[PDB]
Amino acid sequence: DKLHSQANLMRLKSDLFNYPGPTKDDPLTVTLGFTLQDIVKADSSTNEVDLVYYEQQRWKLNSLMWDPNEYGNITDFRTSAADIWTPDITAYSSTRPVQVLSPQIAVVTHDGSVMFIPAQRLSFMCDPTGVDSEEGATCAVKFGSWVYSGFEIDLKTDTDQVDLSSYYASSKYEILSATQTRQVQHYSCCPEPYIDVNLVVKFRER
Amino acid sequence: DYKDDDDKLHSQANLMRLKSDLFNMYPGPTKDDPLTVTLGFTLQDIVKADSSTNEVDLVYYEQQRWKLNSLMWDPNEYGNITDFRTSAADIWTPDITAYSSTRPVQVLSPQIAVVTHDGSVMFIPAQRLSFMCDPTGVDSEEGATCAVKFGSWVYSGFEIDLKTDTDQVDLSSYYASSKYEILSATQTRQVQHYSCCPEPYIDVNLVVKFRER
Amino acid sequence: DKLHSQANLMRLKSDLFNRPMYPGPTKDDPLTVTLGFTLQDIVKADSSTNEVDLVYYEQQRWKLNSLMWDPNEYGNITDFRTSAADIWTPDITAYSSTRPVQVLSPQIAVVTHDGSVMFIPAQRLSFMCDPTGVDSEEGATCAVKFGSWVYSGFEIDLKTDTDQVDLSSYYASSKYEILSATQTRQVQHYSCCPEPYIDVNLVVKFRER
Amino acid sequence: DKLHSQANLMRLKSDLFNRSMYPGPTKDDPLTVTLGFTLQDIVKADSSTNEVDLVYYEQQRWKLNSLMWDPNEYGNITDFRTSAADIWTPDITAYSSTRPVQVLSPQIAVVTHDGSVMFIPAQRLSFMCDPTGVDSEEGATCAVKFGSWVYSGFEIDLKTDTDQVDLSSYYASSKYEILSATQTRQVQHYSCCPEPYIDVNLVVKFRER
Amino acid sequence: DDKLHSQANLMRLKSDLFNRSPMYPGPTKDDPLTVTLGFTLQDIVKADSSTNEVDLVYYEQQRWKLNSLMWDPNEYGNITDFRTSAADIWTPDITAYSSTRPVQVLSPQIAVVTHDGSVMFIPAQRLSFMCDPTGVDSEEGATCAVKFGSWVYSGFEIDLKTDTDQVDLSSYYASSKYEILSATQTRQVQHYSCCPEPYIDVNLVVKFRER
């Protein structure tokens, strides 16, 4: 019985995993949302600030679809992010390699939906000057696909408000506002427009 | 003695046979087939308390225990082999994660687990962790108080359930010469809902009260 | 249909990659790599060790006959993205780094049907620089060469589309402002070897804001 | 003959490593690992965190029947060097480390025809130590235990050749001088397990030069 | 093309060499090897007087020769040599004996093999090693030394040789915090009371001061 549930899952996974990424003819849309945990450090000597957050990522591939009834009513499953394609979303203004704080495992559901929530620590270019005043300091960093134009990967948010509800209450810095906004930008390298979600944080000393 | 040397050879052959048989992977737990992970903490040292960033550094090891049917075997079929140590990469392990780390955890111990014939698995990773903590008052008689939650990152309370044996973090190995003394340390199972997921997730809350020695 | 384009792309990649791997350039079959720099930030200048840390991305471009395909055979697919591990990439290396380069970006390249390849790794580099004068109107000047480590100019040759480093993306709040940034192809002779090595010399003049 | 010596050695390694594969020690077939330490340097003593950083060589010796061979069948080859990854190695772990150890030497071991292995990894270790007193004539005393993480004494037992740490490579110019260094086998129980675990206790007494 | 045949030959060569036969077991007493070694010193980056560690940037030139890497160019379309990944071949275990940190690799690991079985390999490294920099702010400067050599092979298996005993300073960074008074690289033979076999290292001695 409980073996039957396993047999069906191993079945489903084996049937499935036997994807070249998106293209202009097969475009993929990624929904991004940020949950900001902490502003760990603000370095005025280098103008770098360190964030800890979660990035929620959602997209859909028909190549991931299946009929639950054939697979014993299995709606969804966890799998290693290595077992599937995942999008290349990248901070455009990092000063160091992002460090991954959580297991890389995604949830795949029968309709082809994939949901993935990497927690990360990020050092990025920010000038904290004013962080000790009432107005505080403002910094911004864009997140987007590195190699994929708007014609291939589109970016969406469900809300322009960063989720602050997990922000660390004892942080050295308190958040005044945090917004996540979709943008369309052009770059020297390429004629095609690239999409980003601009994360803007306004913060000050506690 | 030829017999004794033949005996040792047989045990080896028996062990390899057992390992090859079992490793011919388990998909992970499901709402249909939930799994309970037992968890306890042994706190060795509070290495550093950084009042400039509100990050605190711990060294500890977590005992993880769980049980799987697919890891069961009859010892009499395998020459009285009750248990074996095996690389942790060889088997499924739980994704237990600090919820409030500021840096990737650094692994201080070999990752190898003990598997027993009833399907029991024991695993004790030792770790150094930076997590979010305000050590204000650490220099005071009552010291400072910090907390960090550990639980599965991707599996709700319907897939992975957590339990402790005791609510006392084990202090018997705590470094006597540490810069910080422990006023107390407890480990408590909790149930919480998070915005991303409708299902409740379980964590074990490590709460530590400490001050400068 | 979108299934077909997907089927065609997978087929195209299996044909190009599974049919071994280009062993690299040779005296018989040399290769020109085009290089250009986009300077995002001067993060840190350490006057105690004389190391400066740059954040930049490096555009690299080259072309291999063995990467060509006829689009009409493969669905009029004119190009694709592929992981940089699936193809040969040039060994371009800073000659005066003090630390291993840190990669800030996904490593994925764009291959085109004419066989051209385009790749843009973003990197943080610590290199040897004396920031003395950085506090003055004139500022400080430093230079670092980028070139193949193992391939002389009979094997790999280097080219720039301009001698002007791209500052369009330079961080406006950086501790350091850039006075000038140039990138210049050099034919460099080393007494170790009979054959010249080719590099692109990056020269940055900068000062505290 | 050079090909023959080479050919014999390749055959030997193939015979050994393709043979029916030691799954590691068990209670039925326990193992004694001999451990000795050669202290190179005390690099750093941090009194703000109570950590101390040590550089040292750890000599490890054990013997497996499954590694035995007759030199005669193999051209009188007595011993060979092999990658440490080609064989089983013990899990010896420092019990008090505050950071993952950093390996300073290649991982290659020597295997001799009696089944003996000799493996000497060089390491930099940060471990828990209170430096207090280091600046006095008495100096400071610190201790760290090394033993198997996952194997009880019924599976792995330890021994030393001497109670005396080898000080012959200790760096003459170190910020710290060594007053005494000992290495002593201990037996110990831990909350986790009924079985005793064996460790070798490294005790160092030191002060500022 | 003829450029197409060039690729086929090279590939044919590399396969015949690398795929064919057993992996080179490494040198032995019966089949000993000589490694030639030289240092080009680029920079003294840092001198820490609180830990007595000094950080060097340099590249090493390593050369050795193996019969198992030989080929006749005529057989192979007259290719006299090629570049190959260092993972494709055996490389020597040359190691600093007095380092305090894992060496950091600054250069692509790729070596050049020539038809006579000769290999040249030029790793660039940043190395922290035990050095007391005391006197660096004086006129006579500081002197430090570090030995390099095989970790696991005695003089009977691996022998070391230098082309010159002068460290190459021609590439030294002229704006370095530290200026070099002298740098030498000298072969040394050591014996240990236990054993008749010699042990071989190249001793790098550097005298330097604040610029």
Ligand SMILES: *[C@@H]1O[C@H](CO)[C@@H](O[C@@H]2O[C@H](CO)[C@@H](O[C@@H]3O[C@H](CO[C@H]4O[C@H](CO)[C@@H](O)[C@H](O)[C@@H]4O)[C@@H](O)[C@H](O[C@H]4O[C@H](CO)[C@@H](O)[C@H](O)[C@@H]4O)[C@@H]3O)[C@H](O)[C@H]2NC(C)=O)[C@H](O)[C@H]1NC(C)=O
């Ligand atoms: C692998 O290594 C082994 C062991 O070292 C070598 O085997 C030995 O080979 C040497 C060289 O032939 C042999 O040395 C000879 O010993 C003879 C007497 O041996 C007898 O008695 C012994 C026991 O004491 C028995 O084990 C053995 O079977 C015999 O019954 C001497 O009479 C020889 O001396 C004469 O010859 C030498 C030159 O060979 C002259 O210089 C002397 O002046 C004299 O005329 C000789 O010294 C030895 O016996 C072998 N040992 C065994 C046990 O076999 C292998 O050769 C080696 N394989 C290699 C290197 O390929």
Ligand SMILES: Cn1c(=O)cc(OCc2cn([C@@H]3C[C@H]4CC[C@@H](C3)[N+]4(C)C)nn2)c2ccccc21
């Ligand atoms: C001509 N041409 C194209 O049309 C599309 C390319 O797409 C692939 C790509 C694009 N980028 C960059 C990374 C960073 C910088 C600007 C933007 C696009 N960015 C912010 C996301 N990195 N890889 C391309 C890549 C290299 C050379 C020419 C190219």
Ligand SMILES: Cn1c(=O)cc(OCc2cn([C@@H]3C[C@H]4CC[C@@H](C3)[N+]4(C)C)nn2)c2ccccc21
């Ligand atoms: C809609 N939805 C689900 O119903 C269940 C999911 O479960 C998998 C999962 C859950 N989490 C988080 C990681 C961190 C934050 C909250 C909690 C759960 N947490 C503390 C462990 N990360 N991945 C899920 C994942 C991504 C997007 C939508 C989802």
Ligand SMILES: Cn1c(=O)cc(OCc2cn([C@@H]3C[C@H]4CC[C@@H](C3)[N+]4(C)C)nn2)c2ccccc21
């Ligand atoms: C004579 N000869 C060769 O022609 C090519 C060699 O290999 C290619 C190579 C070259 N370099 C270095 C890297 C850096 C520093 C100086 C120059 C040459 N550089 C700027 C490109 N590193 N690897 C080689 C290797 C050892 C001995 C003689 C050699």
Ligand SMILES: Cn1c(=O)cc(OCc2cn([C@@H]3C[C@H]4CC[C@@H](C3)[N+]4(C)C)nn2)c2ccccc21
């Ligand atoms: C009941 N039981 C056993 O009998 C044997 C086990 O052996 C495997 C093991 C044991 N340790 C620890 C690591 C550290 C701390 C105590 C000691 C043993 N230590 C100093 C070496 N690490 N892995 C075991 C593991 C987890 C839970 C119960 C167990």
Ligand SMILES: Cn1c(=O)cc(OCc2cn([C@@H]3C[C@H]4CC[C@@H](C3)[N+]4(C)C)nn2)c2ccccc21
């Ligand atoms: C008896 N015996 C041998 O004859 C040869 C061995 O060769 C392997 C080896 C030797 N070394 C060290 C590293 C450093 C310090 C001394 C020298 C030899 N060193 C400078 C190269 N590191 N690995 C060996 C290894 C372990 C136990 C006994 C041994």
Ligand SMILES: *[C@@H]1O[C@H](CO)[C@@H](O)[C@H](O)[C@H]1NC(C)=O
């Ligand atoms: C190689 O060079 C030789 C000259 O010695 C020439 O005869 C030959 O045609 C060339 N190529 C081959 C494959 O022999």
